[model samples]
Target: GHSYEKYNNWETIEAWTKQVTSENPDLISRTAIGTTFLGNNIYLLKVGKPGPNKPAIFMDCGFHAREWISHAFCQWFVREAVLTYGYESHMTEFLNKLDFYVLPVLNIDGYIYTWTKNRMWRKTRSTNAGTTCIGTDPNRNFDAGWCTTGASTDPCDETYCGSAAESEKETKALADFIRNNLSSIKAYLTIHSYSQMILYPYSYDYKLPENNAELNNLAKAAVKELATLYGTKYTYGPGATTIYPAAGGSDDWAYDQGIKYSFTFELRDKGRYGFILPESQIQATCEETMLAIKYVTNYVLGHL
Candidate 1:
């Protein structure tokens, strides 16, 4: 329970995943898509009432180890889904019509390193071929314009794109899962932190999505809903323009794979505390993010 308020270690978070699914079997189911390079199971929670055919939203967090709030928000989202499914009408409808594939922590090795070895670690724990620098930036390991622009070729750089697209096991596993579930997964949402942005496609380039206007409108409305909770102002637009161009990002890759509703969320704060956001802020941060996430879910359900 306290894990929700504090940044939890990989073991505790892993246990929590199993425990939560067992406690809410009707609404949550657990599965391991694959293992990290360090052999940690990457757990995914399928949250929603079982149905014959349901369009789903695929969300992943903790691509970078330092962004602890991103990981926290994924767990918090699951908690919100289970707690309010029946009590809240909007949430109830969303869950009934749409399933959520929640990947709570994707880069488990990097996350563990943040807790045990380095608090600011930001890549996978796997080693590179030529350099002593360990780990690829999982966020920059996807196949969307991979290593073309906005990514580093050198393994020593923080934004180093892996040797090839989806080079890291963690990135490859997530991509394989999405490719396998392409038909049901209508929306793709990747969570990051400390910029307060709701970004759509074209992170790998300066281009726009096919349905750019619709995405803009949706992000505007979602950010508005998020603001209602705590007046947490946020910027929204294409990822490259909204933030900066980042090739090989999961969101852009998912969009290219035909998930039109793909988006990236950078949660909480401008830069004061940065990745080390205080524990006291988790409650409010997650509470507001829930509004935006549910807003997107509701929209996806209606359109589907």
Candidate 2:
């Protein structure tokens, strides 16, 4: 039997999704938001009690091509939702109260490239017009404060903001989806890797949002919850100070679009393994991350 305990490739992920949903058809529904540049299906799994007006939480992973661990974390999240539903009171309660929209791989084309060609590719495979450079950093291509602060103009640079906001097909699809679902999405959490930081909005500039204090407090509480579970420490602050100053980030864009509790979690050991974080750490990383996610879910449910 294949080790479903470890990180999976594309085929295995698809298989697991089919298996879980087939087994629990009453509770899970899967839909394809759009197709990637390489034609892979960008799936959105909706998990929770069936309802039309419930508050929803959006969580995405694999925005950066090299961040394989981020993808793993999302797959783990899906597995937990299926395997432990109704058995774990906290998870059961959260699921009963809210719907989770999990996008396991946001940059599918870039992720495949990292697997096939470059081990450290960091951008989507979009053509830079008149330039030989390929790909744009999806994380830096959103419309919020685009091309400002921690981004590069040159397409060759790793952090190149696209020619315009939402230039890449992947970013456009995601943005459109979020816009359509903005009414019910109380919080948006995007998962990235290689840095153990829990960050909130206003990453495009130094100025903070009016709700910055509340957002920071929520992040700190979430971090505290994770710490209690596994002694793992996470720094919590605005993206500019918590990590580097990144412009046009999805979290900031979501927050600007009225999803007030937006956050970006940088998971696992701080740069020890970088993008190639070993499979051994996947379980620990996802276990602690689930706690943080639950903490945020509880907060969003109460506040919204």
Candidate 3:
């Protein structure tokens, strides 16, 4: 009976996904788009009002294994979608105009490994040909200027970029899915943890995108919305300047692929919890994050 709060295991997440889809059959649809290196299903939850040709918003969490709060935020998002459908006009309106593709756990194998073996594992569980060291940082394995300034070539390093872009099954499947659905995705948001920051593109390098101003404005708006509740503040800027430089991240890859409103959200307690955020913070984090998400949705809806 142990769930994400107590156990926070992969099986718990999988069960939660199934329960959400089954209980709210009309609002949520589940899909297993790909498999992890360890053969775990990479599940996608499509939430929002049923409609065609709606601009899509992509949200992924638990990209890094230890960030359990990220996974909680995603599950909370699902709950909001189902419960607030008819009551919350803003969410309902956004759902009417846009679809949300929510992936609660991006690195399932790594997440499971974090629970079982390594508490700080940050990569896909795959064996490299030459090295005994296993796994590749899926975030760094993305194809956009990969293994650049912020990544590592050594297999033992935490930010290993893998043999090549899309080399890891996790990154490959995620990239493939996003590429296939890029036409309708107006905004791509990947959620991570510990740092209270909202980062935008050009993370691979310092060169900001052509729409940097617009992206910053959107991030600022989202931060402002988040700040209104619980006094929870988030710093907003380009990834390289705001946080440590991270090459081949989802935000940068999505931006490079032409999604102008790509943002990465670092959620919950600043440092005390880090990846092992407490369950008591879940509701507040989700509530505040929903404001930011809705704010971004409004901005995107108005522009697109």
Candidate 4:
């Protein structure tokens, strides 16, 4: 009922998650981490072979609802993991050794809003305390440098950081899950869009991550791998200087919790297409992104 090449609405994607998991029961297990503010279940698919002890790489998409490509990428990632597990060498080892905890779409309410109401909606659909303005930027609702920089105190702004860290139910659920699963999750990868960049820690400020050198090299390597497929160029560096200061980011918070291999991937287009990326490009974008993600996964597996 769902195809990875085309962007699917929330209902289709949700059904696809369950259907895919059921079809590939040997390689996948589905669980609901928590519910969105609108009472939609936030599903997490753990993709890997059944094993005794396994480390995991936590990845999520659709932090910003307008970025449909981010949602597509997460679904595409699961498809690739299951479809190529035993046949593809890299994917084979990856699934055999570790679990991929994939949150296909985090901002469920906003994502649905994008599909039905507004195509440009970028925040969660939770109302603010004193203002009629709805939703906080989920990416800016993390505890790391909460509302300090590159975010807004005004709830009406696009970058509103929420009244407090993890104020939005969606963000709080994600943070709590990561906090509880911190021990086994060695890496954190959050997917977003419009700029082709592979960023490491410290989005809140100009500070460098503890393993800056390693991260820089790793990001560079990952980008290089990504480019191999379609010659899609990408920039790579620490998020603050490379992109901009974004306080309370998931990648920064994940790194703060000792997930040393934390990263944020801004996928596809240098703004010619922006968030409304074409369905025709979805396959190419997801294919190249898989290269970069697998590279990082391979590296994390080595370190663990």
TM-score of 2: 0.96
**After superposition, candidate 1 runs with Cα above 4 Å error:** none
Model 3 lowest lDDT segment of ten: 1-10
Candidate 3 residue lDDT tens string, 1-304: 4343343588888988898899988788999889998899999999987777878999999898888788878888888888998898888887777889999898998899888998878777889888899888888988788888789898888889989988887788888999999899988999988788999987888888898998888888889889899999889899988887888788898988989889999997788877767777877888899899888888888898
Each candidate's TM vs. the true structure? 0.98, 0.96, 0.96, 0.99
TM-score of 3: 0.96
C-alpha displacement of 220 in model 4, angstroms? Answer: 0.3
Question: Candidate 3 or 4, higher TM-score?
Answer: 4
Worst 10 residues of 2 by lDDT: 1-10
In model 1, where is the ten-residue run with the lowest total lDDT?
Answer: 1-10
Question: C-alpha displacement of 29 in model 1, angstroms?
Answer: 0.6
Clashing pairs in 1: none
**How much lDDT does candidate 4 score?**
0.94
- For candidate 4, write residues 1-304 as lDDT tens digits: 6888889998899898889999999999999988999999999999999898789999999999999999999999998898998999999999999999999999999999998999999999998787799989998999999999999989899999998999988888999999998889999999999899999989998989889999999999999999999999999999999989999999999999999999999998999989989999999999999999999999999988
lDDT of each: 0.93, 0.86, 0.86, 0.94
Model 4 residue 148 lDDT score:
95
How many Å off is the CA of 179 in candidate 4? 0.9
Pick by lDDT: 3 or 4, better one: 4
Q: Note the residue pairs that clash in candidate 3.
A: none
Off by over 4 Å in 2: 1-4
